[PDB]
Symmetry: C8
Subunit: 30 residues, 8 copies
């Protein structure tokens, strides 16, 4: 359904935020 | 539908937050 | 509809958060 | 309606978060 | 209604996050 | 109701995030 | 119900974010 | 159901954000 699919797009975008935060951790460790 | 479309706009805005965080990682690495 | 319009206001506010984070990246690069 | 009004209050609170992040950018630039 | 009231509690909590971020800006300016 | 109660748990968790950010402000001031 | 249970999982995940932020405060204080 | 499953995916993505923040704490402690 379209609402479930849109909520899954929100989850994917939150995962993109997590990936960006991991890049911040690696930048600080460097 | 309009609710699904609005939830997709929320997902797009969260992706914009992820892109900004990636720019923060690049700024710290520099 | 009013709920879709309110969800679009949430998306616009999240975009404002992304814009503020981009300003943080530019401040760090400077 | 009451649900739309409450979602608009969430959007206003997210805008307050964006404004605070802009203040963080100005603090880092200083 | 109870759902609208709970969404208003979420908005109040997000405002508390904005207030905490403002304290971070003041700490950096100091 | 159970949905309102779960949304109130989300609000309480967001308040925990605000409290943690206040601790970050105190750490930076120190 | 399944939606209430899923919203409670979101609250638990937000509490995990608060715990991680508390670890950031302790790292800065050190 | 599909909406509950999508909300559980949002919770999992928020847990990924918490894990990334824990990595930021470890980077700062180092």
């Amino acid at each position: 359904g379209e609402i479930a699919q849109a909520l899954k797009e929100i989850a994917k975008a939150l995962k993109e935020i997590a990936w960006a935060k991991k890049e911040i951790a690696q930048a600080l460790k460097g």
